[PDB]
Amino acid sequence: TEVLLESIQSKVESIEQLQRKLQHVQPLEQQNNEMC
Amino acid sequence: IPDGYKNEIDQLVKKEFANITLFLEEYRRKYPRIDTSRYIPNESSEVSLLGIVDSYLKHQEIVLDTLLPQTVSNQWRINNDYIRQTCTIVEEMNIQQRKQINDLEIYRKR
């Protein structure tokens, strides 16, 4: 469980960094979603 | 008269009228079947070990391998271009229908 607490911390911080950097293409998503 | 003759004729027409799958359809009643609300919560102190490893580690590793960027925005904008080719085609048909519709009315007018 502590090993996973390490993974949740390390992986989720990378996921949050990857997600915020990616931003769900949030400008490309709006570009793509408004076109839909 | 867009207010008298239509109302008059409607009453005359009115007077002549006075004279004369199983799972899917059931779910439609308005309740979606519940999914596995287990993986997210769990508990260190609480019960079950598999949930820790049989739920969170392997999926997080698959997530971190899946969560990506290598291609990044190039893969997204490539699909955005396809959507623009799909959209213009519809509006071209809107025109073709618009022309033939006005063309038929044009013949009636004469």
Domain total for chain B? 1
Q: Which residue has the tokens 């080719």?
A: B85
Residue with tokens 């508990």: B43
| Min Cα–Cα distance to chain A from B8, Å | 46
Note whether A8 contacts B80, CB cutoff 8 Å.
no
Interface check A8 vs B, CB under 8 A: yes
* The two three-digit tokens of residue B99, written as one number: 């022309």
HSE, side-chain direction, 13 A CA sphere, residue B68 = 10
Interface contact flag, A25 B56, Cβ < 8 Å = no
The tokens for B18 are 């006075």
Task: Name B106's Cβ contacts closer than 8 Å, sequence gap at least 6.
Answer: none
What technique determined this structure? cryo-EM
- Which residue range(s) make up the domain with B49? 1-110
Strands (E), B3-100: none
Q: Please, which residues have CB within 8 angstroms of residue B53's CB and are 6 or more apart in sequence?
A: A4
Question: Resolution limit in angstroms?
Answer: 10.0
